[PDB]
Design an enzyme around this catalytic site. Sequence first.
Site, PDB file in Angstrom:
ATOM      1  N   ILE A  77     -56.540  32.472 -68.907  1.00 27.95           N
ATOM      2  CA  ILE A  77     -57.080  31.196 -69.396  1.00 27.95           C
ATOM      3  C   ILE A  77     -56.408  29.970 -68.763  1.00 27.95           C
ATOM      4  O   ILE A  77     -56.705  28.829 -69.126  1.00 27.95           O
ATOM      5  CB  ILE A  77     -57.019  31.098 -70.949  1.00 27.95           C
ATOM      6  N   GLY A  78     -55.510  30.220 -67.814  1.00 30.48           N
ATOM      7  CA  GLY A  78     -54.787  29.162 -67.114  1.00 30.48           C
ATOM      8  C   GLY A  78     -53.921  29.749 -66.019  1.00 30.48           C
ATOM      9  O   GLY A  78     -53.246  30.751 -66.235  1.00 30.48           O
ATOM     10  N   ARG A  79     -53.956  29.135 -64.841  1.00 27.46           N
ATOM     11  CA  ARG A  79     -53.149  29.572 -63.702  1.00 27.46           C
ATOM     12  C   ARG A  79     -52.754  28.374 -62.846  1.00 27.46           C
ATOM     13  O   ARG A  79     -53.561  27.466 -62.624  1.00 27.46           O
ATOM     14  CB  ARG A  79     -53.896  30.628 -62.871  1.00 27.46           C
ATOM     15  N   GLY A  80     -51.510  28.375 -62.373  1.00 25.34           N
ATOM     16  CA  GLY A  80     -51.013  27.284 -61.546  1.00 25.34           C
ATOM     17  C   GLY A  80     -49.678  27.530 -60.870  1.00 25.34           C
ATOM     18  O   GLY A  80     -49.374  28.651 -60.443  1.00 25.34           O
ATOM     19  N   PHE A  82     -46.043  27.743 -61.332  1.00 18.10           N
ATOM     20  CA  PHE A  82     -45.013  28.768 -61.517  1.00 18.10           C
ATOM     21  C   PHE A  82     -45.516  30.032 -62.216  1.00 18.10           C
ATOM     22  O   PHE A  82     -44.719  30.889 -62.600  1.00 18.10           O
ATOM     23  CB  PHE A  82     -43.799  28.185 -62.252  1.00 18.10           C
ATOM     24  N   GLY A  83     -46.831  30.150 -62.367  1.00 15.40           N
ATOM     25  CA  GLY A  83     -47.425  31.340 -62.968  1.00 15.40           C
ATOM     26  C   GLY A  83     -48.762  31.096 -63.635  1.00 15.40           C
ATOM     27  O   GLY A  83     -49.552  30.265 -63.181  1.00 15.40           O
ATOM     28  N   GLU A  84     -49.008  31.828 -64.718  1.00 17.77           N
ATOM     29  CA  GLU A  84     -50.295  31.786 -65.407  1.00 17.77           C
ATOM     30  C   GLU A  84     -50.180  31.986 -66.920  1.00 17.77           C
ATOM     31  O   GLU A  84     -49.158  32.463 -67.422  1.00 17.77           O
ATOM     32  CB  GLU A  84     -51.264  32.816 -64.804  1.00 17.77           C
ATOM     33  N   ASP A 193     -43.869  13.750 -70.296  1.00 18.90           N
ATOM     34  CA  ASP A 193     -45.111  14.211 -69.671  1.00 18.90           C
ATOM     35  C   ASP A 193     -46.261  14.321 -70.676  1.00 18.90           C
ATOM     36  O   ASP A 193     -46.859  15.387 -70.849  1.00 18.90           O
ATOM     37  CB  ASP A 193     -44.887  15.540 -68.935  1.00 18.90           C
ATOM     38  N   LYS A 195     -49.861  13.990 -71.673  1.00 22.26           N
ATOM     39  CA  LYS A 195     -51.154  14.029 -70.989  1.00 22.26           C
ATOM     40  C   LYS A 195     -52.109  15.014 -71.671  1.00 22.26           C
ATOM     41  O   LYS A 195     -51.658  15.944 -72.344  1.00 22.26           O
ATOM     42  CB  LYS A 195     -50.979  14.379 -69.502  1.00 22.26           C
ATOM     43  N   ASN A 198     -51.486  18.778 -71.772  1.00 23.16           N
ATOM     44  CA  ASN A 198     -50.468  19.260 -72.703  1.00 23.16           C
ATOM     45  C   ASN A 198     -50.879  19.153 -74.175  1.00 23.16           C
ATOM     46  O   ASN A 198     -50.095  19.478 -75.070  1.00 23.16           O
ATOM     47  CB  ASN A 198     -49.142  18.532 -72.458  1.00 23.16           C
ATOM     48  N   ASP A 211     -46.262  23.042 -73.860  1.00 23.31           N
ATOM     49  CA  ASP A 211     -45.429  22.831 -72.665  1.00 23.31           C
ATOM     50  C   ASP A 211     -44.448  21.666 -72.836  1.00 23.31           C
ATOM     51  O   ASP A 211     -44.851  20.521 -73.066  1.00 23.31           O
ATOM     52  CB  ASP A 211     -46.295  22.648 -71.405  1.00 23.31           C
ATOM     53  N   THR A 232     -46.620  12.722 -64.563  1.00 26.09           N
ATOM     54  CA  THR A 232     -47.902  12.858 -63.875  1.00 26.09           C
ATOM     55  C   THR A 232     -48.373  11.479 -63.389  1.00 26.09           C
ATOM     56  O   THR A 232     -48.318  10.511 -64.151  1.00 26.09           O
ATOM     57  CB  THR A 232     -48.959  13.506 -64.809  1.00 26.09           C
TER      58      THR A 232
HETATM   59  C1  LIG Z   1     -50.803  22.265 -67.527  1.00 31.15           C
HETATM   60  C2  LIG Z   1     -49.383  22.670 -67.930  1.00 31.15           C
HETATM   61  N1  LIG Z   1     -48.622  21.474 -68.238  1.00 31.15           N
HETATM   62  C3  LIG Z   1     -49.320  23.654 -69.109  1.00 31.15           C
HETATM   63  C4  LIG Z   1     -50.005  23.125 -70.379  1.00 31.15           C
HETATM   64  C5  LIG Z   1     -49.980  24.138 -71.528  1.00 31.15           C
HETATM   65  C6  LIG Z   1     -50.616  25.461 -71.099  1.00 31.15           C
HETATM   66  C7  LIG Z   1     -50.646  26.445 -72.241  1.00 31.15           C
HETATM   67  O1  LIG Z   1     -49.613  26.937 -72.679  1.00 31.15           O
HETATM   68  N2  LIG Z   1     -51.876  26.715 -72.694  1.00 31.15           N
HETATM   69  C8  LIG Z   1     -52.217  27.363 -73.840  1.00 31.15           C
HETATM   70  C9  LIG Z   1     -51.332  27.583 -74.900  1.00 31.15           C
HETATM   71  C10 LIG Z   1     -51.780  28.255 -76.039  1.00 31.15           C
HETATM   72  N3  LIG Z   1     -53.051  28.685 -76.127  1.00 31.15           N
HETATM   73  C11 LIG Z   1     -53.924  28.482 -75.128  1.00 31.15           C
HETATM   74  C12 LIG Z   1     -53.529  27.820 -73.967  1.00 31.15           C
HETATM   75  C13 LIG Z   1     -49.848  26.016 -69.895  1.00 31.15           C
HETATM   76  C14 LIG Z   1     -49.871  25.034 -68.723  1.00 31.15           C
END
Ligand SMILES: C[C@@H](N)[C@H]1CC[C@H](C(=O)Nc2ccncc2)CC1
Lengths: 400, 398
Positions: A77-80, A82-84, A193, A195, A198, A211, A232
């Site tokens: 559900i998220g990747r960038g 230092f990881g995912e 940070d 935004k 976050n 985060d 940012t």
């Molecule tokens: C963009 C980065 N600053 C960072 C923002 C928060 C994200 C996250 O934990 N997402 C998340 C947490 C809990 N449930 C769903 C998604 C990880 C990446």
Amino acid sequence: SFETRFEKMDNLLRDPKSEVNSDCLLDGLDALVYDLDFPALRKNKNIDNFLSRYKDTINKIRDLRMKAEDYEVVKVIGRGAFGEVQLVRHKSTRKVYAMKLLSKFEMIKRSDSAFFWEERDIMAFANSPWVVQLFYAFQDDRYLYMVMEYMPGGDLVNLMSNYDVPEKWARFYTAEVVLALDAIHSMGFIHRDVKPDNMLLDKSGHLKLADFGTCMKMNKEGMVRCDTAVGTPDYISPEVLKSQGGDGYYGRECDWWSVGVFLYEMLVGDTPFYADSLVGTYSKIMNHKNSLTFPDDNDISKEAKNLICAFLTDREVRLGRNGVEEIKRHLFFKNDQWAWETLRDTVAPVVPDLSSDIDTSNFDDLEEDKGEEETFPIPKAFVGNQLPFVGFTYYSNRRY
Amino acid sequence: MSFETRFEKMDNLLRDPKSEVNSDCLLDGLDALVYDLDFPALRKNKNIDNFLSRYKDTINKIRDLRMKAEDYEVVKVIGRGAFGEVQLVRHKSTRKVYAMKLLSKFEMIKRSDSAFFWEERDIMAFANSPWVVQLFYAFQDDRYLYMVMEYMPGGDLVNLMSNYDVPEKWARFYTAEVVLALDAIHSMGFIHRDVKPDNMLLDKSGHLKLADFGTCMKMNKEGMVRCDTAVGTPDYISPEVLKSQGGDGYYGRECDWWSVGVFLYEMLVGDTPFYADSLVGTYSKIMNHKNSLTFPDDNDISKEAKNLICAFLTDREVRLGRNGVEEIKRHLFFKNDQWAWETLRDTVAPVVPDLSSDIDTSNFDDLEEDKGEEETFPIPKAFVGNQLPFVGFTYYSN
Ligand SMILES: C[C@@H](N)[C@H]1CC[C@H](C(=O)Nc2ccncc2)CC1
Ligand SMILES: C[C@@H](N)[C@H]1CC[C@H](C(=O)Nc2ccncc2)CC1
């Protein structure tokens, strides 16, 4: 005394905040074995012997302690950088979490902060409805793992991209951000940070900050000294951006600036200092006194424009400098639907309708897959790469 | 297993005194890692430099809080030589009297042999037998291993044999107590390999306990153990253990029964059966035991005594004790009207030591002095890890 000594030692092994609790000790051993099991190092007798002695034991431990294969990855559900982040289900308890992976090698590949300690500390001990909770933290030779509560509502970036946010909503979200930031400040931190990325929403549509790698502890006078800028491009305050070797000494007003940028973006649809390129945004921020304008759109109330301008000013005259109470008393927040002390108990402007516990509709569909990426190079001498991540595990000594 | 089970199995492991990963052992690992890295050559690495900077404060406090050497007041040295000295100590706080055994880490390292102490720690700590000298505490620093044992004020059998022309009644008693002591060791799954008067200590009531188990080994599936290693004073060592010098030999527990035969002979004769002026001379006589084992022309030694000695001082294949301890116990030499096997350690001992105080060391010789400027490790230019072989040695009792 003899008893006192034995007891002080016994607490030092129990305390969830102790640098030598069972978690830290099991990490210390786990790190050593990892950082020695190499044919080049195995030539040394001491090392070769020690490893053969603990081989059976260390394997039993790694199976008993919380590990990656204990979780079934439902979806990324998220990747960038230092990881995912991946939605996971615990194979045994069937419970659903959002797990964050941090590449040990990549953070060592010139990060400069060990930022993860702040992130671990806050998310684990904040115990606040405004902070995404950290349940478990563990590791192997390659990744740090953070088991957080799943925020199925998605982030504010996703929300703003799907709605032309009306004032009623903007007020609510700004108000929840204000309370969230105040909770962080009360803990003795400056977020640095703030935004939409976050800002995450729960199943009820209420906001939490996720985060905290950029967080730093304030001093006695509630200030922070930093030579290198953090944040940012669009949301960074003038003073944090200009922070130099000359000094770089700022307070929590830098967070309130970012809230102003956040409010502006929700009502306008664009960031107040958008430019062609990144470097253009910099100039506009520094020239905020003349660059900050509202488009000819008679839908932004007087109070909205006021609060934004009260936030998007020089640190010295910036709203929030005299505490959060002067922000809360702002006329923009004046409404008849909620009060500050009961806000997170009211019904949210957008209550997400979820199909299952693993509903990820509020998150963009990411590829998933990869094929394990490059980590540390096999050492020829003792390097000790696992040493910086000793004590990161949060499993054996958690707070209840 | 459920998550609760997995979590709790792991959490019990941290408190289990018999666990290699209990809290005390884990503290050793961290304590050691700090020692084998705190060198300017290694401090050049950031991972190492930052690690030591973080645990600087914590590791010092830990070292001061845990059981250390200066917690004990050394009353008197009562043993020396090997890798250190055995000294009568009084715990400064509890005022309790113990016998503390020291083992030089450098000395152990210098000449390989740095693993024997695990057997000694395990047996003395968990045997929980009246035939085994009890180990209460075990700790360490950067240089010595420390073993806090119960003090045996009665002295050893060497001291007793040098003060008495041991009569048969006594010889029988002590032999019988040794047999039960060795059987207890065998039942735990060990072959002692070093049965001798030096290792036989007496308590305040004059009853025997085995002390020092640094040569004990765990028997395999068939109750055997292969071995290679040099030998000190072959006087009590069996032919099989001597023939097995280089992994070229598997021997059973009947090697201990041989040593009991040497022990019995020495008590009744006054000399060891295969004594010679040189070490290799003694060895030769043990190998030629079939022809070298003789008895003096004074039949003070009874028929049964000669029989048992000869039954023990034979080839492993026909040696008494090969069919269990019961065939030894049934030997006519042990036939008496003063005690029974199952009640032996409850009977009155032939020599009950008369002690002045709790620190009475009259049954131990005064020792010279070491003038010992003990050698220390040189400052490393790379990771050597001299502490790794001693990680997990620390032990406490409740
Ligand atoms: C963009 C980065 N600053 C960072 C923002 C928060 C994200 C996250 O934990 N997402 C998340 C947490 C809990 N449930 C769903 C998604 C990880 C990446
Ligand atoms: C010579 C070695 N085989 C060995 C014999 C036993 C001795 C000892 O622990 N003695 C002792 C124990 C308890 N109380 C007093 C003395 C240590 C050295």
